[PDB]
């Protein structure tokens, strides 16, 4: 709501932005269009029902501008819950006039917020610039994850057995050096630690179940 109200200040009314709260700007723009009877403004707002204005504080701001006949509001509705964003206390100002529209054409613009999956180039370009000893650790936890995935009570491997497996596969040598190798993994949103009740920091990978299954096929070369 700040990118629309503050955009008609230094462009339509020619005034720099200096308001305080939200209610301070609402009652300041009404006096500019009430005393003057020659300031028309057409609002060709597209898709009014987006996804970040479902609160009741968003329609009460635009509802005040609808009381004046000098302000024109043109909005589009693309949802079956049209009267869910306004009640009887707001229809007196807007005075909606319904007009059915039949176009039959797909959408190729706003399709971006929907969840696709994750880009495979991120998991591929992260191992090329990674130390050789760290790649063997990432390829070792993925093997024990799919073999124990059938168990519904999978809480993750502990830290004692993880430290023993390192020297069994010629990896890390000490403990403080092993914790330093997990710094670039927790910052890249690959693994995270949880406050376990048994005093053991669990190790899990918050990704999709189908993503780890397609990682062993690209490392065959």
């Amino acid at each position: 709501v700040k990118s629309v109200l503050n955009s008609i200040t230094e462009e339509v009314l020619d005034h720099m932005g200096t308001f305080r709260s939200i209610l301070d700007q609402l009652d300041w723009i009404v006096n500019k269009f009430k005393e003057d009877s020659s300031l028309e403004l057409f609002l060709l707002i597209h898709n009014l029902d987006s996804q970040m204005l479902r609160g009741e504080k968003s329609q009460q701001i635009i509802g005040q501008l609808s009381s004046l006949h000098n302000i024109y509001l043109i909005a589009s509705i693309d949802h079956l819950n049209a009267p869910l964003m306004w009640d009887h206390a707001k229809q007196s100002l807007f005075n909606w006039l319904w007009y059915e529209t039949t176009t039959y054409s797909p959408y190729t613009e706003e399709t971006s917020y929907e969840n696709s999956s994750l880009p495979l180039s991120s998991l591929t370009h992260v191992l090329r610039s990674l130390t050789p000893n760290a790649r063997g650790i990432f390829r070792l936890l993925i093997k024990y994850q799919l073999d124990n995935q059938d168990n519904p009570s999978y809480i993750g491997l502990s830290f004692q057995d993880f430290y023993q497996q390192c020297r069994e596969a010629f990896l890390v040598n000490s403990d403080l050096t092993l914790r330093a190798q997990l710094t670039e993994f927790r910052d890249h949103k690959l693994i995270r630690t949880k406050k376990g009740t048994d005093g053991v920091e669990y190790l899990l990978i918050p990704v999709d179940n189908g993503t780890l299954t397609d990682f062993l096929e690209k490392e065959e070369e």
Partner: protein
């Protein structure tokens, strides 16, 4: 001979002072310089995100290419960026707004961004301005709105700006730039840098010492070991130049011992002792009353930690139950009594030398603490036979 002359000149070349070396970095540098030649000649402009390796010292690589373009072509101007003194996400655009066209400058008037900065860039009569970007990940916000205007300028009308971002690898295009994998207008370019293994760390040292020194001070067997573990952590150039320079001053200090009062080859044993206090535990030096490890009043408390793990199947304890185990073993052994009024200071005392750790809690006593690693370190190398030998056999 030239003994004192070689040591006073070796510390200058081994110190981390703008390592602007050309060898050992061929295919990682020619692609960067050739990418800018097509934009200055072909009248093109786009974006270029450089995702460097976390901590490898590549800031001197970009400075070499920028100074070579000044001597080749004369007419363009390059503005630098140093946002290290900007703790907030704002106050970044006005910081670089005072450099319009070198000799032609202006003055700010308060609240005037996104209007005059992008206006002079679209002017075709001006030269090709090159803007440098650094630590772009630290300029994020709650909705990274400040990063939505600097990545769309070389893609709208009049594209006359090349984006060069020098930053290490922390996160790719997931939440910083949501335009990728969603919009088909922007087409950025990504170049990574793998960590330098022994094929580059050993090579970068041959042209570093043999060109400025007269005779080497170490053998060739010590080079293969120092360049082996430095590439296992990250592969930083400063870490490789510091692990070798520090191993020389410890040997040079031993030269002035019953010699000057009235070159040599540094062995491999003199290098392992320097990294001994980095990853190795300092629990061996404890003879002749040398206080280089553990005093006394702390070993009688940490010895009871394993006595509670094998009985409760848990590795976490607290300050409350720690005094209960100490109040029982003191009355049956007649030792020094330590009240719990000063036992909390011992919790903020046993953290160095790579041992147990803890966190911060508001209330006392009830403090969730844990242990680092306990397996086999109390025998062989450590005594624990005549001191706390009767404690482990008691319970």
């Amino acid at each position: 001979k030239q003994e004192g002359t070689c040591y006073q000149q070796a510390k200058l070349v081994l110190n981390t002072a703008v390592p602007d070396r050309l060898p050992a970095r061929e295919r990682e540098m020619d692609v960067i310089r050739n990418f800018l030649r097509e934009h200055i000649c072909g009248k093109k402009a786009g974006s270029l995100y450089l995702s460097g390796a976390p901590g490898t010292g590549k800031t001197a690589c970009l400075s070499r290419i920028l100074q070579d373009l000044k001597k080749e072509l004369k007419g363009f101007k390059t503005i630098m960026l140093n946002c290290m003194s900007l703790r907030t996400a704002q106050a970044v655009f006005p910081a670089i707004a005072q450099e319009i066209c070198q000799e032609e400058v202006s003055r700010p008037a308060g609240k005037d961004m996104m209007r005059k900065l992008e206006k002079h860039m679209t002017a075709e009569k001006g030269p090709m301005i090159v803007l440098v970007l650094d630590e772009m990940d630290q300029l994020d916000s709650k909705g990274q709105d400040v990063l939505y205007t600097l990545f769309e300028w070389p893609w709208l009308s009049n594209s006359h700006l090349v984006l060069i971002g020098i930053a290490n690898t922390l996160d790719l295009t997931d939440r910083i730039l949501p335009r990728l994998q969603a919009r088909e207008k922007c087409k950025p370019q990504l170049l990574n840098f793998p960590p330098y293994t022994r094929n580059q760390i050993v090579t970068i040292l041959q042209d570093r010492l043999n060109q400025v020194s007269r005779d080497q001070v170490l053998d060739n067997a010590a080079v293969q070991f120092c360049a082996r573990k430095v590439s296992a952590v990250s592969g930083d150039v400063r870490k490789a130049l510091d692990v070798c320079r520090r191993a020389i001053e410890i040997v040079e200090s031993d030269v002035k011992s019953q010699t000057i009062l009235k070159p040599k080859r540094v062995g491999l044993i003199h290098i392992s002792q320097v990294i001994s206090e980095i990853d190795g535990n300092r629990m061996t030096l404890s003879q002749e009353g040398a206080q280089d490890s553990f005093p006394l009043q702390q070993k009688i408390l940490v010895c009871s930690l394993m006595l509670l793990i094998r009985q409760l199947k848990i590795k976490e304890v607290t300050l409350g139950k720690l005094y209960e185990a100490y109040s029982k073993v003191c009355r049956k052994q007649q030792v020094a009594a330590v009240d719990q009024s000063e036992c909390l200071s011992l919790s903020g005392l046993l953290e160095a030398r790579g041992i147990l750790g803890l966190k911060r809690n508001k209330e006392t006593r009830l403090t969730k603490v844990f242990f680092k690693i306990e397996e086999k370190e109390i025998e062989h190398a450590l005594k624990d036979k005549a001191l706390i030998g009767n404690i482990l056999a008691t319970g």
